[PDB]
Amino acid sequence: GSTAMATTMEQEICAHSMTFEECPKCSALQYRNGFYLLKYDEEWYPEELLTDGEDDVFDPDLDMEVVFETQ
Numbered sequence: 001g002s003t004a005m006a007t008t009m010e011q012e013i014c015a016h017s018m019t020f021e022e023c024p025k026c027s028a029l030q031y032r033n034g035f036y037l038l039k040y041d042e043e044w045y046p047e048e049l050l051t052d053g054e055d056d057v058f059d060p061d062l063d064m065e066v067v068f069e070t071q
């Protein structure tokens with residue numbers, strides 16, 4: 001159920017930040033979300049193919065301030 005086992009875990013795990021129940025909301029909010037949705041990318045094939053787990057995207061340092069939604 002929604003990737004997770006019907007959100008039994010309850011540890012707020014998602015591509016963005018929230019639970020799998022709120023995963024569609026999270027996906028809608030940022031769109032990129034570790035390039036979970038392939039369709040988002042212009043070339044279709046994104047740099048990060050893998051579904052974001054725990055801060056998988058932007059692993060190398062980009063900005064000093066760590067904000068999940070950073071462009």
Ligand SMILES: [Zn+2]
Nearest residue numbers: 014015016023
């Ligand atoms: Zn997500």
